[PDB]
Write a protein that binds this ligand. Structure first.
Ligand SMILES: [Mn+2]
Ligand SMILES: [Mn+2]
Ligand SMILES: [Mn+2]
Ligand SMILES: [Mn+2]
Ligand code: NA
Length: 348
DNA sequence: CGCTAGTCGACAT
DNA sequence: TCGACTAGCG
């Protein structure tokens, strides 16, 4: 996510209860629940010892939403995004490192720290996610496996008007241009909501409350697709966008040092990386549940060439995309591991 | 002082 | 894929 974004725009936030959305549809970034539930059994997950606790943990929240008359759509991550491979590598390295370290501390004698290491080695696999999918489907809850990041999928579901709000712990969804996002929701329904249109309640943002400029700010501050320049965070990026009054962003990015009264040399590849990051936020592939078709998050504008956007996710056949979305197709082996059919009585 | 980057408990049961 | 907290910076 965008580090400290929630704190930066805290004025646009509002404490709520999910009963606000009774008789409505809400999409869920299920990974958060999955992780929080996986914490309660980190050791057994690390050792490979069998446990299905995260399932019950997620189903608690699901049953809560269902109890408050909410129609929940559980969304899951799919294939790895090429423009996110660095962060994936780092995360993986941290995971195996902390795993081995914990395994060592188990032999040393210190379990209190070994457990804490096992917490950092949490690896949420597609199998666990599929268990959760099984449970949710047994409780009549619609599930959707994103072709890539669940973030973009949720953003699409919200923009398309399929869902009214998004439940997540990740502030990336705001950069994607979600309308309504519910952060920090507990097991009872208490949560914090940020509306896009209410970003203007943040005086600190200045005139950076439009989707495009807000996105630019989030990218410049540092995201999962492009690391920020050293010494650059939300405040300075927002300052850059505030002080500058130019339509073309590239020139401003080239004058970032000028706008911040600093000596900031911008590498040539950083501009290209910014273009790539922007295009990743705008055009990352998602799955249209209605038309059952792979589409970019936003329709391609005239100023972009879709053939250069491989990093935003590659296209596959719509039937394969469908089988992935249903969770029937294994992400890694591309083999069919289930036979769920929505026609045999979200997908029309 | 304001802001960024990095650490470690919390996460949760 | 978190965030309070804070060393340590300009
Ligand atoms: Mn993120
Ligand atoms: Mn794929
Ligand atoms: Mn995500
Ligand atoms: Mn994200
Ligand atoms: Na940054």
């Amino acid at each position: 996510g965008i580090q400290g974004l929630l704190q930066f725009i805290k004025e646009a936030s509002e404490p709520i209860h999910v009963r606000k959305y009774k008789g409505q549809v809400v999409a869920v970034d299920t990974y958060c629940w999955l992780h929080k539930g996986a914490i309660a059994c980190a050791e057994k997950l690390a050792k490979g010892e069998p446990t299905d606790r995260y399932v019950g943990f997620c189903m608690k929240f699901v049953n809560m939403l269902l109890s408050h008359g909410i129609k929940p759509i559980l969304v899951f991550d799919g294939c790895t995004l090429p423009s996110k491979k660095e962060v994936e590598r780092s995360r993986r390295e941290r995971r195996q490192a902390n795993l081995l370290k914990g395994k060592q501390l188990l032999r040393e004698g210190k379990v209190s720290e070994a457990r804490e290491c096992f917490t950092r080695s949490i690896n949420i696999t597609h199998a666990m996610a599929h268990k959760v999918i099984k449970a949710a489907r047994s409780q009549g809850v619609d599930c959707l496996v994103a072709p890539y990041e669940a973030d973009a999928q949720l953003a699409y579901l919200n923009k398309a008007g399929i869902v009214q709000a998004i439940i997540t712990e990740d502030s990336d969804l705001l950069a994607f241009g979600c309308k309504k996002v519910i952060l920090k929701m507990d097991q009872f329904g208490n949560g914090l909501e940020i509306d896009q249109a209410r970003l203007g309640m943040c005086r600190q943002l200045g005139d950076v409350f439009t989707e495009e400029k807000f996105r630019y700010m989030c990218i410049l501050s540092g995201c999962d697709y492009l690391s920020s320049l050293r010494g650059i965070g939300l405040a300075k990026a927002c300052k850059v966008l505030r002080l500058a009054n130019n339509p073309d962003i590239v020139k401003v990015i080239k004058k970032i040092g000028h706008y911040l009264k600093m000596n900031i040399t911008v590498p040539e590849d950083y501009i290209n990386g910014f273009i790539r990051a922007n295009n990743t936020f705008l055009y990352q592939l998602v799955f249209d549940p209605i038309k059952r078709k792979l589409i970019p998050l936003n329709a391609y504008e005239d100023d972009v060439d879709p053939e250069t956007l491989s990093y935003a996710g590659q296209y596959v056949d719509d039937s394969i995309a469908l089988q992935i979305a249903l969770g029937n197709k294994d992400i890694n082996t591309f083999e069919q591991i289930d036979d769920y059919n929505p026609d045999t009585a979200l997908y029309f």
